[PDB]
Amino acid sequence: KLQNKINHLLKNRQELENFNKLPSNTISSENHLEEGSALADKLKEYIDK
């Protein structure tokens, strides 16, 4: 589900990339990428366990 969220946010970024006019929304998508990366590291720790 987190990887599908990455797909949704990158689709939103592809919607809002050209003729940029950047909203106040994409930094939450970047924080969500960091959260998914952190959860990926935690599940990597768990599969090592």
At 42, list the tokens: 């935690």
Q: How far apart, in Å, are the Cα atoms of 12 and each of 1, 24, 41?
A: 16, 13, 25
Residue with tokens 């952190």: 38
Handedness of CA 45, 47, 48, 49 (dihedral sign): positive
Place of tokens 């990158």: 10
Provide the residue type at 14 as one letter: Q
Query: How far is the CA of 46 from the CAs of 25, 28, 29, 33, 49, in angstroms?
Result: 32, 26, 25, 20, 5
Distance CA 44, CA 21 (A): 37
Query: How was this model experimentally determined?
Result: cryo-EM
Q: Cα 47 to chain center, whole Å?
A: 22
Give start and end residues of each alpha helix (H) in 1-49: 2-15, 26-48
Question: Do residues 2 and 39 lie in contact, with contact meaning Cβ atoms separated by under 8 Å?
Answer: yes
